[PDB]
Amino acid sequence: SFLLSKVSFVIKKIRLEKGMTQEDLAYKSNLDRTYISGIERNSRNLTIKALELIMKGLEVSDVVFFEMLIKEILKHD
Amino acid sequence: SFLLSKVSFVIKKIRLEKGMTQEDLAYKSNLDRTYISGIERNSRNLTIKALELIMKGLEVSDVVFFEMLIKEILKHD
C-alpha cells in the first residue's frame, strides 16, 4: 500500500539525510542489517517497537518522523 | 515506553469515540479479538500492516491517527 511504501521511504530518506549506511543504522537501532534492508523494501511487518528503535538509531524524534510521514501522505496520496 | 503506551491509547480512544467494542474492531480490522485486546494493552509487537488494518476498521485516516498521536506525545511527554 501507499502507507507501507511511505513508511519505508521516510526511514530511507532520513537515514540518507544523516549520511548513514544500512549497516550504521543496524548497529545504532539494535536491529540487524538484513532486517533494516527488508524494512526499507517493505515495512509490512515492521513493529512499533522496531520503529522506535530505528527513530532512536536515526536520532530523530517520533514527532518529526510522523510529521514527515503525514507530509508525504498529504502531498502524494 | 511512552510511544508504545500512546499508540495503544490513541487506538482505544478512537475506538470508544466511534462507539465500537473490541469485538466490533476485530471484525472490521480482520484481526482477532485477543490481538486487538493485546495491542490495546501493549503495542510493542503491533506491525505497520496491522495498524493500517485497524485505521481502516476504525474508518479513520492514517493522517488523523498520526496527528492525534503527535498531539498526545507533544502535550504529555
Author numbering:
A (entry chain A), B (entry chain A): 3 to 79
Reproduce text from the manuscript describing this model.
The most widespread of these mechanisms employs a “controller” (C) protein encoded by a gene downstream of its own promoter, and usually co-transcribed with the endonuclease (R) gene as a single transcriptional unit. Unusually, in the RM system Esp1396I, the C-protein also represses the MTase (M) gene by binding to the promoter at the transcriptional start site, denoted OM where the C/R genes and the M gene are transcribed convergently from different promoters. Flexibility in this loop is very important for DNA sequence recognition, as it has been observed in the nucleoprotein structures to adopt different conformations depending on which operator site the protein is bound to.
The KD for the S52A interaction with the OM operator was 5 fold higher than the wild type, confirming the importance of this hydrogen bond interaction in stabilising the DNA-protein complex. Both of the R46A crystal structures and the S52A crystal structure have adopted loop conformation III, despite the varying buffer conditions and crystallographic interactions in those three structures. Both the monoclinic R46A and S52A structures show almost identical crystal contacts to those of the triclinic wild type protein, even though the space group and unit cell are different.
